């Protein structure tokens, strides 16, 4: 009578139900990468977008909400057209320069 046994079949169901969600979702996401999230996750040099991301905060500190609003559309457009994103995140050249 140690906890007896609730329909072992039902136990196995849950025992698998858990094995499912974890792998079919979390583990999948962790090991692997969606065919859509390739243009964003890998970028040769992500130093130009960080400049804007810091600059908007810097402007925010010193008021000037006009520049604060005019520089958010500039960022929102970079996630719209992949050609400009690829152009801007390309690796820098001073080394052979």
């Amino acid at each position: 009578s140690f906890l007896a046994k609730v329909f072992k079949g039902g136990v196995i169901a849950v025992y698998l139900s858990v094995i499912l969600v974890v792998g079919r979702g979390l583990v999948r996401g962790i090991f692997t990468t969606s065919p859509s999230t390739v243009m964003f996750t890998e970028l040769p040099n992500a130093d130009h977008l960080l400049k804007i991301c810091l600059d908007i905060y810097l402007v925010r500190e010193a008021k000037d909400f006009m520049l604060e609003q005019d520089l958010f559309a500039k960022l929102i457009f970079l996630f719209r057209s992949p050609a400009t994103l690829i152009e801007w995140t390309r690796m820098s050249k001073k080394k052979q320069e």
């Binding site: 964003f40 970028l43 040099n45 992500a46 130093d47 977008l49 960080l50 991301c53 908007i56 960022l75």
Partner: peptide, 21 residues
């Protein structure tokens, strides 16, 4: 909502640049 979008964009950019470094 624009605030949350901007914070998400900042987190993504930070992670990408730092992983490259």
């Amino acid at each position: 909502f624009d605030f949350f979008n901007m914070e998400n964009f900042y987190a993504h950019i930070f992670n990408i640049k730092c992983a490259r470094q």
